[PDB]
């Protein structure tokens, strides 16, 4: 078990003990994001499982957050159970708090309150004065999202938490981190984190799927024509045949799907492009209709030119094109 200062990955999820001096933890790395913690008459402790970012990005250029919790826990002392993380330039540290122990946080008085995940959370900001940073000692701001009432399992919708803190003028900086996260102040406890699921990207399955015809696409390359079997659509016959439309994208992650087929039994390839990066590539592995999926891509809000290209044939294919999906 970790019982001093690490940081890491554990299975994809990078994962971080901190405590300062005084009483004793134990951090216990299972699957997933989940972990199981105790400690033991500490001054601060912390145990967390989320993401690490570079600090280059804002939380709307990485996407919307999502995280489904569930954890025994069992604070003796002033303790929290949060999403919790931090911003640079600003520095913030940041929690979304669904439960504590004996003391409710953080003091002070409201500046609104937001409705989210069947509960109410009132929201905050604090100051901390020459206090331990990921930037060391420092002064910054922290931001709050409190529960009204306890809960230890769920979902966190952290974006909307965000959107509310800029929302009332808590202006976030590029993200550094977003972590279940759970912390004893003074105090002794343990917890086991048996559901800990951060979500980048996805949504509900109904927000609507926009889907383009690749017959209204615009055609490129030597090629490129319409065809009506097995499908109303296009046909890339050759190396540079491709079809291209720009899209506008409104979230920043996206899944794309793509019906089409090979003309014979033989693997057909298909690139795909979005503001001129290849993204990746559609798989048809025979003559029939099939729809091939690239989940999650990060491309980023804005307008930008989706590219469909042939890039790998050699005479023994050709790439039948009906539609694209943008999820
Ligand atoms: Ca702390
Ligand atoms: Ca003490
Ligand atoms: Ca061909
Ligand atoms: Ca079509």
């Given at each position: 078990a970790i019982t001093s200062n690490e940081i890491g990955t554990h299975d994809g999820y990078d994962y971080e003990f901190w405590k300062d001096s005084g009483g004793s933890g134990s951090m216990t790395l299972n699957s997933g994001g989940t972990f199981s913690a105790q400690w033991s008459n500490v001054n601060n402790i912390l145990f967390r499982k989320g993401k690490k970012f570079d600090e280059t990005q804002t939380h709307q250029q990485i996407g919307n957050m999502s995280i489904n919790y569930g954890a025994t826990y069992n604070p003796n002392g002033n303790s929290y159970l949060a999403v919790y993380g931090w911003t640079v330039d600003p520095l913030v540290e940041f929690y979304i708090v669904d439960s504590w122990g004996t003391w409710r946080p953080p003091g002070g008085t409201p500046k609104g309150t937001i409705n989210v995940d069947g509960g109410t959370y009132q929201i905050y900001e604090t100051t901390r004065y020459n206090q331990p940073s990921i930037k060391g000692t420092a002064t910054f701001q922290q931001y709050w999202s409190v529960r009204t009432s306890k809960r230890t399992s769920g979902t966190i919708s952290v974006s909307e938490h965000f959107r509310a803190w800029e929302s009332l003028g808590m202006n976030m900086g590029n993200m550094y981190e977003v972590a279940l996260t759970v912390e004893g102040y003074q105090s002794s406890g343990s917890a086991n984190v048996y559901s800990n699921t951060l979500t980048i990207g996805g949504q509900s399955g109904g927000e609507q799927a926009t889907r383009v015809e690749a017959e209204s696409m615009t055609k490129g390359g030597p090629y490129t024509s319409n065809i009506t079997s097995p499908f109303n659509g296009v046909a890339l016959y050759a190396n540079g045949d491709n079809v291209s439309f720009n899209h506008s994208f409104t979230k920043a992650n996206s899944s794309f799907s793509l019906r089409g087929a090979s003309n014979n039994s033989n693997m057909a390839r298909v690139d795909l492009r979005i503001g001129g990066q290849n993204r990746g590539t559609f798989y048809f592995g025979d003559q029939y209709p099939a729809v091939y999926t690239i989940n999650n891509?990060?491309?980023?809000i804005g307008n930008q030119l989706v590219e469909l290209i042939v890039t790998a044939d050699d005479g023994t294919w050709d790439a039948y094109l009906d539609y694209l999906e943008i999820r």
């Open positions: 891509i990060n491309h980023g």
